[PDB]
Amino acid sequence: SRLNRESVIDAALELLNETGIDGLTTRKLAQKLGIEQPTLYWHVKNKRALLDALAVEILARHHDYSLPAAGESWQSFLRNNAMSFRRALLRYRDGAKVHLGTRPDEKQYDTVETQLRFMTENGFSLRDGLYAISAVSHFTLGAVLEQQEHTAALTDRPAAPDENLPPLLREALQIMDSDDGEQAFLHGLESLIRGFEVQLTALLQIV
Amino acid sequence: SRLNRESVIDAALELLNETGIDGLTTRKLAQKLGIEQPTLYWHVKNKRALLDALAVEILARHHDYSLPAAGESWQSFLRNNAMSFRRALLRYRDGAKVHLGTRPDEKQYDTVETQLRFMTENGFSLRDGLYAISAVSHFTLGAVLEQQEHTAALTDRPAAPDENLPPLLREALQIMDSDDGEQAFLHGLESLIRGFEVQLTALLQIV
Ligand SMILES: CN(C)[C@@H]1C(O)=C(C(N)=O)C(=O)[C@@]2(O)C(O)=C3C(=O)c4c(O)cccc4[C@@](C)(O)[C@H]3[C@H](O)[C@@H]12
Ligand SMILES: CN(C)[C@@H]1C(O)=C(C(N)=O)C(=O)[C@@]2(O)C(O)=C3C(=O)c4c(O)cccc4[C@@](C)(O)[C@H]3[C@H](O)[C@@H]12
Ligand SMILES: [Cl-]
Ligand SMILES: [Cl-]
Ligand SMILES: [Cl-]
Ligand SMILES: [Cl-]
Ligand SMILES: [Cl-]
Ligand SMILES: [Cl-]
Ligand SMILES: [Mg+2]
Ligand SMILES: [Mg+2]
């Protein structure tokens, strides 16, 4: 089929979503595209470069809340941004995984520069604003990956017996099995944001 | 070589550390152990079960701060525990990755029940204590994985040019390249803990 960049990335994203990073091989990508491997190689040579492109594409498609509304508080922006980031990463198998360790792409520079400047306009130093952004990002990535991977491993095996569990752990596992992860995510997100705030508002005060 | 459980797990952990989850194959594990694949299969059949065992072993070996000191505050316990968890996960290639989505093993029940009870003795409901524990865990996992994966991909390719970057992003990348991730981790950890505290101390007050 067609092998422009958009279509190669579209096929790789479809494949990722089917069988994850491990199934994103030259043979399988070549097969989905109905081409031979040396044909594929002309268009994409390097798995990390493909993964990097997929990480960028996932957010282009489904990360809706990348910039603050006019007059929006930093707290509200980080909340809305985090929910959006989470939703985008949950949209594909291994979506969070593809993101890990990437750095912003040139297609994202204007957006992420605006995010950083926005933080600094709300009183953060660049460094403290980056710490807040990194913490929200890391929290969100971790939450998504644990959610995704746990669900994936139900398929590779049953959990365990209910029998030998101690009681608080038994209830905690019930609490966790009763939701997809969003409730715990939202709770932790607020705790994170409030701690950033206490830190920002302290200035040079002991806090 | 010897194929008791301890030795199979020891070889799989060595292999994980060399080439990660992708290199942890039956051929490669069989090779490290100097055995044939059907020999290996008698001892370990299921990759997820092996990964699960490795996630448990990593913490047994190197997660030193799994329980509170007598009289230790919950805040201090979560801080010390998180630093320890992070150090244990950083100790092997893909260590954080192997952890993702696991649930506590029976060998860990007494310890993790104690952690949960400890939280509830310090005023958290089981659910809110679990939210705090999950948030700290998710934050820590995300931070470690981003650190590890970024470093891994320097080897698969150079980053980019310095030229076209906007200025705040340029400085932010300098800030990040100047540390391994520990400074941002510690800062975010304190923000997290303080937000848990504001939440706990509020009780039924609007906060
Ligand atoms: C989740 N959210 C907080 C951000 C975000 O919404 C975006 C995005 N493209 O809209 C990121 O790229 C964002 O998710 C993200 O991935 C970022 C980073 O990776 C990052 C980095 O690794 C080094 C320097 C700067 C950054 C940033 C500023 O681009 C962040 C960025 O703020 C993150
Ligand atoms: C990092 N730290 C906060 C904890 C920890 O130090 C340990 C450990 N074995 O010492 C966990 O297993 C710990 O890291 C960890 O992984 C936990 C969980 O995965 C978990 C879970 O998935 C479902 C229910 C309960 C749990 C817990 C309580 O076992 C947590 C546990 O509190 C986490
Ligand atoms: Cl074409
Ligand atoms: Cl789509
Ligand atoms: Cl607002
Ligand atoms: Cl033996
Ligand atoms: Cl060791
Ligand atoms: Cl203390
Ligand atoms: Mg990122
Ligand atoms: Mg866990």
- Chain B residues lying within 8 Å of A102, measured CB to CB: 149-150, 153
Q: Are A64 and A89 in contact (CB under 8 A)?
A: no
Q: Any idea what DSSP says for residue A170? A: H
- Chain A residues lying within 8 Å of B141, measured CB to CB: 141-142, 145-146
What does the alpha-carbon distance between residue A25 and residue A5 come to, in Å, rounded to a whole number?
A: 17
For B155, counting Cβ atoms within 10 Å of its Cβ (0-12 exposed, 13-18 middle, 19+ buried), the class is exposed
Q: What angle do CA A117, A87, A191 make, to 5 degrees?
A: 65
Query: Which residue's CA is the nearest one to ligand 2's atom 28?
Result: B112
- List phi, psi (to 5°) of A25: -110, 165
Partner-chain contact A131 B188, CB within 8 Å? yes
CA B40 remoteness from chain centre = 28
DSSP for chain B?
A: ---SHHHHHHHHHHHHHHHHHHH--HHHHHHHHT--HHHHHHH---HHHHHHHHHHHHHHHH----SPPTT--HHHHHHHHHHHHHHHHHTSTTHHHHHTT----GGGHHHHHHHHHHHHHTT--HHHHHHHHHHHHHHHHHHHHHHHHHHHHHHH-----SSS--HHHHHHHHHHHTS-SHHHHHHHHHHHHHHHHHHHHHTTS--
Partner-chain contact A135 B188, CB within 8 Å? yes
Q: Are B187 and B130 in contact (CB under 8 A)?
A: no
CA B93 remoteness from chain centre = 11
- Chain A residues lying within 8 Å of B128, measured CB to CB: 187
DSSP for B53-101?
A: HHHHHHHHHH----SPPTT--HHHHHHHHHHHHHHHHHTSTTHHHHHTT
C-alpha distances out from residue B140 to A110, A138, B81, B103, Å: 29, 8, 10, 16
Long-range residue pairs from B36-42, CB within 8 A, at least 24 positions apart, any chain:
B39/B3, B40/B3, B42/B3
Q: For residue B90, which of B8, B134, B47, B152 has the smallest C-alpha distance?
A: B152
The token pair that represents B121 in the structure block:
């003795």
C-alpha distances out from residue A30 to A52, A164, B92, B123, Å: 19, 49, 33, 57
- How many CB atoms neighbour CB A86 within 10 A? 23
Long-range residue pairs from A17-23, CB within 8 A, at least 24 positions apart, any chain:
A17/A92, A17/A93, A18/A93, A19/A93, A20/A93, A20/A94, A20/A97, A21/A51, A21/A94, A21/A97, A21/A98, A22/B22
Binding site residues of B for tetracycline, as ranges? Answer: 63, 81
The token pair that represents A84 in the structure block:
């959006």
CATH 1.10.10.60 fits B1-65, yes or no: yes
Ligand 9 centre from A141 Cα, in Å?
A: 9
Resolution of the experimental structure, in angstroms: 1.4
For A177, residues 6+ apart whose C-beta sits below 8 A from its C-beta are: none
Q: Which ligand 1 atom is nearest residue A115's CA? A: 32
Way the structure was solved: X-ray
Ligand 6 centre from B43 Cα, in Å?
A: 9
The token pair that represents B110 in the structure block:
């007494």
Owner of token pair 């957010």: A59
The token pair that represents B156 in the structure block:
């698969």
Partner-chain contact A46 B139, CB within 8 Å? no
What does the alpha-carbon distance between residue A151 and residue B80 come to, in Å, rounded to a whole number?
A: 29
Label residue B105 left, alpha or beta by phi (over 0 means left) and psi (-120 to 50 means alpha). Answer: beta
The token pair that represents B199 in the structure block:
């939440």
Superfamily of domain A66-206 in CATH is: Tetracycline Repressor, domain 2 (1.10.357.10)
User: Closest-CA residue in chain B for A96?
Assistant: B142
Q: For residue A103, which of B161, B59, B23 has the smallest C-alpha distance?
A: B161
What does the alpha-carbon distance between residue A177 and residue A192 come to, in Å, rounded to a whole number?
A: 24
What does the alpha-carbon distance between residue B39 and residue B6 come to, in Å, rounded to a whole number?
A: 16
Query: Angle, to 10 degrees, between the axis of helix A74-90 and the axis of helix A47-62?
Result: 120
3-state SS class at A174: helix
Owner of token pair 């993790």: B112
Label residue B195 left, alpha or beta by phi (over 0 means left) and psi (-120 to 50 means alpha). Answer: alpha
Domain extents for chain B?
1-65, 66-206
- List phi, psi (to 5°) of B122: -95, 15
User: Closest-CA residue in chain B for A99?
Assistant: B146
Across the interface, which of B101, B116, B143 has its CB nearest the CB of A150?
B101
Which residue from A112, A144, A192 has its CB within 8 A of the most atoms of ligand 1, so it is best to mutate?
A112
- List phi, psi (to 5°) of A137: -65, -45
The token pair that represents B153 in the structure block:
């991909």
What does the alpha-carbon distance between residue B18 and residue B121 come to, in Å, rounded to a whole number?
A: 42
Q: Any idea what DSSP says for residue A45? A: -
Torsion of CA B35, B38, B41, B42, to 10 degrees: -90
Query: Which residue's CA is the nearest one to ligand 1's atom 6?
Result: A66
Partner-chain contact A138 B150, CB within 8 Å? no
- List phi, psi (to 5°) of A154: -70, -40
Owner of token pair 């303080």: B194
- Chain A residues lying within 8 Å of B198, measured CB to CB: 191, 194-195, 198
Identity at A74, one-letter amino acid code = W
Partner-chain contact A166 B110, CB within 8 Å? yes
Does the beta carbon of A63 sit less than 6 angstroms from any atom of ligand 1? Answer: yes
Which residue from B62, B115, B126 has its CB within 8 A of the most atoms of ligand 2, so it is best to mutate?
B115
> Longest C-alpha distance within chain A, in Å?
65
Q: Any idea what DSSP says for residue A71? A: T
Which ligand minimizes its atom distance to the CA of B98?
A: 10
What does the alpha-carbon distance between residue B65 and residue B83 come to, in Å, rounded to a whole number?
A: 8
Which ligand minimizes its atom distance to the CA of A133?
A: 1
Binding site residues of B for Mg(2+), as ranges? Answer: 99
Label residue A203 left, alpha or beta by phi (over 0 means left) and psi (-120 to 50 means alpha). Answer: left
DSSP for A102-169?
A: ----GGGHHHHHHHHHHHHHTT--HHHHHHHHHHHHHHHHHHHHHHHHHHHHHHH-----SSS--HHH
What does the alpha-carbon distance between residue A177 and residue B52 come to, in Å, rounded to a whole number?
A: 19
Q: Give the distance from residue B149's alpha carbon to the nearest chain A alpha carbon, in angstroms.
A: 5
Q: Any idea what DSSP says for residue A4? A: S
Owner of token pair 């952890």: B99
Q: Are A195 and A203 in contact (CB under 8 A)?
A: no
